[PDB]
Amino acid sequence: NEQLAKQKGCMACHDLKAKKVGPAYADVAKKYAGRKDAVDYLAGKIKKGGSGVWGSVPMPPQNVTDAEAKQLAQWILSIK
Amino acid sequence: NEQLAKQKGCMACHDLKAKKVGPAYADVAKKYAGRKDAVDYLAGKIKKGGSGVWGSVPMPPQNVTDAEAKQLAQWILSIK
Ligand code: HEC
Ligand code: HEC
């Protein structure tokens, strides 16, 4: 039960339910750290959408330019 | 950049950084849905700790009785 989980400190490292469907940007940055094709890969994902890397729920295609997609990819890749 | 990510709606489905190291309970429940040994498995994980199912950061052993471990497992398995 939930009150026992709280009183035991469990909720310091767990949530009940994921608050966001997509991966956290720092986790994306870590997965793709050290890869020369990461910006091109991600900029295309962000623009066209995709599924199956992190799970089965898809990212819909996003309303960004190629420029904006590239920049978002560069920014996410710097997150730490 | 971050302001473009916000203005594009990206933060509806992403965080910058994971807020918790461990999996969300609803995700645990889904992974283990439909398994007769799930309560025994999880009660042991919660009590003894573990790593490598969700990632490499370990769950330390937790200060719970066997009773409490079993109940926490039963509760997490009901989360949806
Ligand atoms: C607004 C322009 C953005 C930007 C910059 C990003 N997203 Fe998403 N995203 C969502 C889901 C469900 C996933 C996982 C897809 C899969 O499992 O393959 C993602 C993934 C990403 C990534 C990583 C891509 C990869 O192949 O590793 C990145 C860099 C990313 N997104 C950026 C879900 C959503 C949304 C839900 C409705 C929304 C809105 C966005 N994402 C928006 C954006
Ligand atoms: C307080 C008593 C609890 C309870 C009920 C649970 N946890 Fe944790 N947990 C943490 C990490 C990093 C993981 C992943 C471990 C790996 O990758 O194998 C987990 C995992 C779990 C599970 C799922 C276990 C499985 O094998 O699928 C469950 C049911 C669970 N925990 C319950 C991290 C932490 C903590 C960080 C310091 C703390 C505190 C807890 N967990 C506490 C608890």
Residue numbers in the entry:
A (entry chain A), B (entry chain A): 1 to 80
The authors write:
To investigate formation of oligomers in E. coli, we freeze-thawed E. coli cells expressing wild-type (WT) HT cyt c552, and performed size exclusion chromatography for the extracted solution. Therefore, we attributed the peak at 50–75 ml to HT cyt c552 oligomers. However, no oligomers were detected in the chromatogram when HT cyt c552 and cyt c552 free E. coli lysate were freeze-thawed together, indicating that HT cyt c552 oligomers were formed in E. coli by non-covalent association of its monomers. There was one HT cyt c552 protomer in the asymmetric unit of the crystal, and a domain-swapped structure of dimeric HT cyt c552 was obtained at 1.8 Å resolution. The hinge loop was composed of Ala18, Lys19, and Lys20. The N-terminal α-helix from Asn1 to Lys17, together with the heme, was swapped between protomers in the dimer. The domain-swapped dimer of HT cyt c552 also exhibited high thermostability by maintaining the high density of the amino acid side chains as in the monomer, where the dimer did not dissociate to monomers at 70 °C12. When a holo protein is formed, it creates a transient oligomer with an apo protein. A heme is inserted to the apo protein of the transient holo-apo complex, refolding to a domain-swapped dimer. Our results reveal that more domain-swapped oligomers are formed for more stable proteins, and exceedingly stable proteins may have disadvantages by forming oligomer by-products in cells.
Hydrogenobacter thermophilus (HT) cyt c552 is a thermostable c-type cytochrome. Its high thermostability is achieved by the dense packing of the side chains of hydrophobic amino acids. HT cyt c552 has been shown to form dimers by domain swapping, but the swapping region (N-terminal α-helix and heme) was different from that of horse cyt c12. In this study, we expressed thermostable HT cyt c552 in E. coli cells, and found that HT cyt c552 forms oligomers by domain swapping in E. coli cells.
